[PDB]
């Protein structure tokens, strides 16, 4: 029932963000390097250029301390990132000593303005507090003070990702008062058939209305949403939140419109180990498809599975295909956060976290990011369907 299964299967994959332990580790032009890269996000722009974002975690793999927001672009608008030589060297969206810049959540607007929502916190604060920094300082716990809370920032590019504006703090506008912890995405926002932008965040969606690249933002509060959410517009044109659960088990899904959402409920078809996932609107003509990617396991992040739903409301996803069927060598053990885009040559492009595990669950375990391309035929020709 899917003509794509008859096309020749295609896959290729290679490390795109190379951690400090690897040959040719990724460093900025300034010489600044990174122990680990985590928290991927990818979008294809209106030109066809692909922009890949990540957190550059300077000294360890930990969520706190000196973390910068880094990126790579495809060298041209037409190369579709097919091989390592198609990608530019590492660049920086925003960096700094005193800050923790993370949670890249991009969305491409009609005018090709690429918006990138981001989180910021102080480099001396952490989620739990009392964590040890490289210099032996102990962090303070994230709190509701201006200095100590998670901020929500916005930067954009008007030149196809070549340069980025100094990020603007939108916390007072788009984060509820009295909040301490926060998250936006991470992964991506979307543009609706009806023209609005929707960016998933902790307990809310951020809605963009008005002129492309000159949007008015507002907050849609959600009941029972997760901290790390994904959003897609399903074939029926409705909205679909698919969120990381607070405890290991299953993805938490809710459906709605810009007028409001129904309740979140576990999707028993989508096991999840309490980790971020990604979702992608593929096409609208028969057969319409939504793509989903996470670790398909209640316990482990190393069960990465890409799936297709043919449902108008994405009610059920197929078994799909295990990413390990096309394993990458020399970049650690694949599994974790992910982000997906369509490419100009009819593939799906996916960024996927990978972990060398050289320090076990400890702070010195190097983390890299894999770039995969595969077509629908590759997914559909999986042996476990």
Ligand X SMILES: CC(=O)N[C@H]1[C@H]([C@H](O)[C@H](O)CO)OC(C(=O)O)=C[C@@H]1O
Measured from the CB atom, the residue of 96 and 162 that comes closer to Na ion is 96
- Measured between alpha carbons, how far apart are the two ends of the chain, in Å? 14
Residue 333 lies near ligand X (rule: CB under 6 A): no
The span from the CA of 11 to the CA of 122, in Å, is: 40
With CB under 5 to 8 Å by kind, the binding choice for 228 among ligand X, Na ion, none is: ligand X
- The residue within the footprint of ligand X, chosen from 63, 311, 313, 325 (CB under 6 A), is 63
CB of 22 to ligand X, least distance (A): 20
- d(C-alpha 54, C-alpha 101), whole Å: 10
Q: Which stretch binds Na ion (CB under 5 A): 40-48, 64-72, 190-198, 288-296?
A: 64-72
Q: How far is the CB of 212 from ligand X (least distance, A)?
A: 29
Q: How far is the CB of 127 from ligand X (least distance, A)?
A: 5
- Considering the complex, state which of residue 207 and residue 275 has its C-beta at the smaller distance from ligand X: 275
- Give 67 or 184: the residue with its C-beta nearer to Na ion: 67
Contact of residue 258 among Na ion, ligand X, none (CB under 5-8 Å per partner type): none
302 is in an annotated binding site: yes
Residue 66 CA to residue 85 CA, distance in Å, equals 29
Choose the contact partner of 99 out of Na ion, ligand X, none; CB within 5 to 8 A by kind.
Na ion
Q: Under the criterion CB under 6 A, does residue 39 sit at the interface with ligand X? A: yes
Would you give the binding string for Na ion spanning residues 87-116, x where CB under 5 A is met?
Answer: ---------x--x-----------------
**Ligand-binding site membership of 127 (annotated):** yes
Residue with tokens 């409001």: 260
Q: Is 68 in the site for Na ion (CB under 5 A)?
A: yes
The site partner of 277 among Na ion, ligand X, none (C-beta below 5 to 8 Å per kind) is none
Residue 370 backbone dihedrals phi, psi, to 5 degrees: -90, 140
Question: φ and ψ at 379, to 5 degrees?
Answer: -60, -50
CB of 141 to ligand X, least distance (A): 13
Q: How far is the CB of 95 from Na ion (least distance, A)?
A: 6
Which is nearer to ligand X, 228 or 334 (by Cβ)?
228
User: Please, which residue, 66 or 334, has the CB nearer to Na ion?
Assistant: 66
* Rounded-to-integer distance, Cα 192 and Cα 361, Å: 40
Cβ atoms < 10 Å from Cβ of 304: 27
| Residue 26 in the binding site for ligand X (CB under 6 A) | no
| Pair of tokens at residue 66 | 């000196």
Burial class (CB in 10 A: 0-12, 13-18, 19+), 8: exposed
Task: Report the partner that residue 170 touches, choosing among Na ion, ligand X, none (CB closer than 5 to 8 A by kind).
Answer: none
Considering the rule CB under 6 A, would residue 227 count as an interface residue with ligand X?
Answer: yes
Q: Smallest distance, Å, CB 136 to ligand X?
A: 21
Q: Using the rule CB under 6 A, which residue among 26, 109, 228, 267 binds ligand X?
A: 228
| 364 contact, one of Na ion, ligand X, none, CB 5-8 Å limit per kind | none
**Nearest distance in Å: CB 165, ligand X:** 22
- Which does residue 283 touch among ligand X, Na ion, none (CB within 5 to 8 A, set by kind)? none
Calculated CA dihedral for residues 309, 269, 373, 12, nearest 10 degrees: -130
244 is in an annotated binding site: yes
Site for ligand X in 118-157 (CB under 6 A): 119, 127
Q: Which residues contribute to the annotated binding site for substrate?
A: 38, 57, 63, 127, 244, 301-302, 310-311, 316, 337, 355-357
List of residues contacting ligand X (CB under 6 A): 39, 63, 102, 119, 127, 183, 227-228, 244
């Amino acid at each position: 029932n899917d003509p794509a299964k008859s096309a020749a299967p295609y896959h290729d994959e290679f490390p795109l963000f190379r951690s400090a332990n690897m040959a040719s580790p990724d460093k900025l032009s300034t010489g600044i390097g990174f122990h680990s890269f985590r928290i991927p996000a990818v979008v294809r722009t209106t030109t066809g250029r692909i922009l890949a974002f990540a957190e550059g975690r300077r000294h360890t793999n930990q969520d706190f301390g000196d973390i910068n927001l880094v990126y790579k672009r495809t060298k041209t608008t037409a190369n579709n990132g097919a091989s390592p030589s198609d990608w530019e060297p590492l660049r920086e969206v925003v960096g700094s000593g005193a800050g923790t810049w993370g949670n890249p959540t991009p969305v491409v607007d009609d005018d090709n303005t690429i918006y990138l929502f981001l989180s910021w916190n102080g480099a001396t604060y952490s989620q739990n507090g009392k964590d040890v920094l490289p210099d032996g300082t102990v962090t303070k716990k994230i709190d509701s003070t201006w200095e100590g809370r998670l901020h929500l920032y916005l930067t954009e590019s008007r030149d196809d990702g070549n340069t980025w504006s100094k990020p603007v703090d939108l916390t007072k506008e788009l984060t509820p008062d009295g909040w301490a912890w926060d998250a936006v995405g991470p992964g991506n926002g979307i543009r609706l058939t009806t023209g609005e932008l929707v960016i998933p965040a902790m307990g809310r969606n951020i809605i963009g209305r008005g002129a492309p690249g000159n949007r008015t933002w507002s907050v849609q509060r959600l009941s029972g949403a997760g901290a790390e959410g994904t959003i897609v517009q399903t074939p029926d044109g409705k909205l679909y939140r698919n969120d990381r659960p607070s405890q290991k088990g299953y993805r938490m899904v809710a459906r709605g419109t810009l007028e409001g959402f129904g309740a979140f409920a576990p999707d028993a078809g989508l096991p999840d180990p309490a980790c971020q996932g990604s979702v992608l609107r593929y096409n609208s003509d028969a057969p319409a498809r939504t793509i989903f990617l996470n670790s398909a396991s209640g316990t482990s992040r190393r069960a990465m599975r890409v799936r297709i739903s043919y449902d108008a409301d994405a009610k059920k996803f197929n078994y799909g295909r295990k990413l390990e069927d096309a394993k990458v060598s020399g970049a650690g053990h694949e599994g974790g956060y992910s982000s997906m885009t369509k490419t100009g040559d009819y593939k799906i492009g996916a960024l996927v976290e990978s972990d060398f595990f050289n320090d076990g669950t400890g702070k010195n375990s190097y983390r890299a990011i894999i770039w995969r391309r595969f077509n629908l035929s590759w997914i559909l020709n999986g042996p476990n369907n």
